[PDB]
Design a protein around this ligand. Sequence first.
Ligand code: CLA
Ligand code: CLA
Ligand code: CLA
Ligand code: CLA
Ligand SMILES: CCCCCCCCCCCCCCCC(=O)OC[C@H](CO[C@@H]1O[C@H](CS(=O)(=O)O)[C@@H](O)[C@H](O)[C@H]1O)OC(=O)CCCCCCCCCCCCCCC
Ligand SMILES: CCCCCCCCCCCCCCCC(=O)OC[C@H](COP(=O)(O)OC[C@@H](O)CO)OC(=O)CCCCCCCCCCCCCCC
Ligand SMILES: CC1=C(/C=C/C(C)=C/C=C\C(C)=C\C=C\C=C(C)\C=C\C=C(C)\C=C\C2=C(C)CCCC2(C)C)C(C)(C)CCC1
Lengths: 56, 122
Amino acid sequence: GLPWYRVHTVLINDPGRLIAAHLMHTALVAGWAGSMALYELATFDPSDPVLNPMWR
Amino acid sequence: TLTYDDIVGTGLANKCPTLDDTARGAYPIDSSQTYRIARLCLQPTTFLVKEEPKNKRQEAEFVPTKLVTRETTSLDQIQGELKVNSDGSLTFVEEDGIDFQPVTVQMAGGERIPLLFTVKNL
Ligand code: CLA
Ligand code: CLA
Ligand code: CLA
Ligand code: CLA
Ligand SMILES: CCCCCCCCCCCCCCCC(=O)OC[C@H](CO[C@@H]1O[C@H](CS(=O)(=O)O)[C@@H](O)[C@H](O)[C@H]1O)OC(=O)CCCCCCCCCCCCCCC
Ligand SMILES: CCCCCCCCCCCCCCCC(=O)OC[C@H](COP(=O)(O)OC[C@@H](O)CO)OC(=O)CCCCCCCCCCCCCCC
Ligand SMILES: CC1=C(/C=C/C(C)=C/C=C\C(C)=C\C=C\C=C(C)\C=C\C=C(C)\C=C\C2=C(C)CCCC2(C)C)C(C)(C)CCC1
């Protein structure tokens, strides 16, 4: 069969499943953004923009 | 004249009585007469808490907070002697009443600041 590093080429001639795959990727990235924001908000101390800003 | 049923659950019970705009008069003090306050009421509208100074050690400011304990905040039915002093100044000496309320206000960032809002032994 297909080697492991070629598994995704099945989408090359399957525009619908390729769109599906792009949707999933996009979902993962947006989910990441949401979760990163949540974690940062769960750890960020907003109490000192002077000496403790976000970049610190 | 409003009854309990008119007031209950409206929030008005936590409001102090108001006087209309024409009330800019003067109440004479007879320095030979003894006086009392029959009802003193205090209705807070804003609670401010002094932010803890970053370490800059400049002037820390009082910041707004959000009331979370609802309309449970007013001091009322407070009564006491109103003494007339020899220099003609008046001194209120709180004796009794509902002269305290526990209050929790919440700061930016979520920190809750409980306090005993009071005029006890005023
Ligand atoms: C838009 C970005 C993009 C896209 C859509 C593709 C699309 C594809 N490439 Mg890839 N490729 C890309 C960028 C991209 N490539 C880049 C930047 C490189 C340089 C490293 C390569 C190198 C590359 C090679 C060398 C090959 C492909 C091949 C493939 C195809 C099969 C993929 C597969 O089956 O993997 C299956 C993959 C796995 C089962 C696991 C991979 C695990 C990785 C290595 C580690 C974990 C990755 C992690 C989850 C991703 C985080 C996201 C990242 C951006 C930070 C497929 C058409 C293959 C191909 O052409 O097939 C005929 C192939 O031979 N690509
Ligand atoms: C953008 C991400 C992405 C997308 C859209 C696809 C899309 C697809 N993959 Mg690919 N795949 C991916 C990533 C992705 N894959 C990665 C990273 C790997 C390496 C593990 C593989 C390995 C893979 C294989 C081996 C095969 C496919 C195949 C397929 C297709 C059928 C779905 C399937 O079999 O899933 C299989 C893939 C997975 C179930 C992904 C693994 C899940 C990882 C471990 C993360 C799970 C999230 C988890 C809850 C978080 C963990 C947190 C941790 C801190 C504990 C489908 C087109 C199949 C295909 O059609 O081949 C012809 C196929 O056989 N995929
Ligand atoms: C009306 C014209 C039109 C429009 C507006 C789009 C719009 C877009 N195309 Mg599509 N496309 C079109 C015609 C059009 N295409 C045609 C004629 C073809 C040839 C068949 C394709 C083939 C195509 C492919 C192969 C792919 C796209 C993808 C994308 C999207 C990439 C941006 C993205 O995902 O943002 C993120 C998304 C959002 C911020 C949400 C947008 C809200 C959507 C539009 C509402 C969904 C409801 C709607 C009624 C149903 C789908 C609408 C459809 C016309 C796109 C995007 C939605 C890609 C994609 O779908 O990947 C995920 C992709 O892979 N397009
Ligand atoms: C514009 C930015 C961008 C781009 C170009 C891509 C591009 C792509 N993403 Mg990625 N992604 C992005 C942003 C981006 N992503 C973001 C912001 C997120 C949220 C964190 C994700 C999350 C994400 C996930 C979860 C997945 C992808 C996958 C993929 C690939 C799908 C096509 C494939 O089959 O490749 C085949 C794979 C390759 C060609 C290898 C890519 C190697 C990268 C560039 C570096 C790998 C680093 C190292 C070897 C392993 C990681 C370290 C480890 C300790 C964790 C593709 C390369 C999917 C994929 O990789 O499936 C296999 C997949 O699983 N992406
Ligand atoms: C640490 C581990 C814990 C994590 C667990 C969480 C997820 C558990 C579920 C995993 C088990 C999947 C069983 C496979 C189902 C199946 O039938 O496959 C085939 C199905 C179609 O159904 C099928 O389709 C087949 C043909 S075809 O694929 O349509 O061509 C056909 O054989 C069949 O009749 C039909 O039913 O299509 C697929 O190929 C999808 C399988 C890939 C699923 C793995 C992805 C999991 C990651 C998702 C994370 C989301 C991220 C958030 C972003 C929003
Ligand atoms: C965040 C989500 C994370 C989930 C994703 C999981 C990540 C999966 C990573 C897959 C990588 C597996 C590696 C495939 C390894 C393997 O299968 O290779 C053998 C493979 C042969 O494949 P073929 O083309 O012959 O086809 C056979 C098929 O059966 C393959 O499926 O070649 C390749 O895959 C190219 C890479 C070669 C790599 C060679 C390096 C190894 C040599 C020794 C290195 C260490 C010693 C050095 C001493 C100094
Ligand atoms: C479905 C449903 C629901 C739910 C959803 C959810 C529950 C959510 C989500 C999302 C999510 C929550 C998930 C996810 C994401 C994550 C990610 C995607 C991350 C990434 C990772 C990677 C990719 C990276 C790698 C790294 C390593 C790890 C280390 C270092 C190096 C690097 C950087 C490479 C709702 C209500 C909405 C509605 C609709 C439907």
